[PDB]
Amino acid sequence: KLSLQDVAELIRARACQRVVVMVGAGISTPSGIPDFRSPGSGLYSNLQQYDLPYPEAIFELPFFFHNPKPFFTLAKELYPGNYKPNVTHYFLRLLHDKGLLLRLYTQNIDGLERVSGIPASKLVEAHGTFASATCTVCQRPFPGEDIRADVMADRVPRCPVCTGVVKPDIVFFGEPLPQRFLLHVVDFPMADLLLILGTSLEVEPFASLTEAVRSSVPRLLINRDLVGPLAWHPRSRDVAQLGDVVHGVESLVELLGWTEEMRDLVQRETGKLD
Amino acid sequence: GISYGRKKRRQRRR
Ligand SMILES: [Zn+2]
Numbered sequence: 572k573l574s575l576q577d578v579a580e581l582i583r584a585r586a587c588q589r590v591v592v593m594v595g596a597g598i599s600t601p602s603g604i605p606d607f608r609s610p611g612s613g614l615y616s617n618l619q620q621y622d623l624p625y626p627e628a629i630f631e632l633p634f635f636f637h638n639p640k641p642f643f644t645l646a647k648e649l650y651p652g653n654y655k656p657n658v659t660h661y662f663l664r665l666l667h668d669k670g671l672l673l674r675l676y677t678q679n680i681d682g683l684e685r686v687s688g689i690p691a692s693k694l695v696e697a698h699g700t701f702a703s704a705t706c707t708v709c710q711r712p713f714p715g716e717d718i719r720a721d722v723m724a725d726r727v728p729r730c731p732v733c734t735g736v737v738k739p740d741i742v743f744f745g746e747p748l749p750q751r752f753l754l755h756v757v758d759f760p761m762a763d764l765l766l767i768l769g770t771s772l773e774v775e776p777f778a779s780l781t782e783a784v785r786s787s788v789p790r791l792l793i794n795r796d797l798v799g800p801l802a803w804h805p806r807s808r809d810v811a812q813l814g815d816v817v818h819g820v821e822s823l824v825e826l827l828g829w830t831e832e833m834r835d836l837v838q839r840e841t842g843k844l845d
Numbered sequence: 846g847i848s849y850g851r852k853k854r855r856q857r858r859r
Binding site: 588627700742743744745746747748752753755772773774775776777779798799803817 | 846849850851852853854855857858
């Protein structure tokens with residue numbers, strides 16, 4: 572049974588230098604990104620006007636073609652420029668700068684991993700991105716910038732060719748993940764450490780990646796609960812730092828001795844985004 | 846990939 576400091580010592584001695592990371596929405600809540608399932612935020616109020624039978628309908632294709640306005644309300648909120656990366660993103664940024672990051676697999680669509688400075692080659696946006704869009708009728712591709720004006724003006728973007736609805740390349744339920752997700756067949760056999768930050772692992776096939784690392788590879792989970800196949804199929808080197816994600820990260824950063832270097836990185840990265 | 850398919854919701858909780 573390993574501890575949090577044991578995983579930290581392995582990283583300090585470069586015993587684990589091919590880390591794959593799996594992150595979910597829990598790492599972006601500190602940035603102020605609201606959970607549209609609970610009242611309070613202006614996003615929730617702007618989504619109340621639409622008769623959503625359940626919050627997950629916003630990522631379902633049948634409801635999207637019934638009424639795409641709820642989705643583009645979320646798209647307008649999550650389009651780049653509204654939110655900044657938080658300390659958890661920059662810890663992963665520092666991990667890449669020190670040459671320890673093999674790949675970052677994210678379920679999030681806020682694009683904050685790219686904003687933090689992690690190159691696209693190191694990133695697998697497994698649930699899509701707002702950086703590109705596709706016409707639902709004629710499959711014509713579009714840069715995300717070409718529909719930004721319509722999205723910001725609360726207009727459902729239409730295809731200039733066939734007038735079909737142009738949908739951002741966000742992976743809806745029932746759709747296969749982007750082709751870049753197939754990098755897991757190469758990355759996960761190669762990983763020597765698996766970090767799982769801020770996710771409940773309720774969505775497949777992303778959740779089952781935790782069991783794709785080899786048997787001797789430790790799996791560090793920083794989350795408020797023990798979730799997913801880490802609870803029914805735990806392994807001998809599984810480490811679970813239960814609690815607040817940010818507190819778990821800044822605890823690991825302190826055990827690594829990166830606290831001062833991390834803060835200097837954040838202030839220079841945050842200020843440049845102004 | 847060994848039968849990796851659509852984006853789908855899981856179970857076994859709550
Ligand atoms: Zn079209």
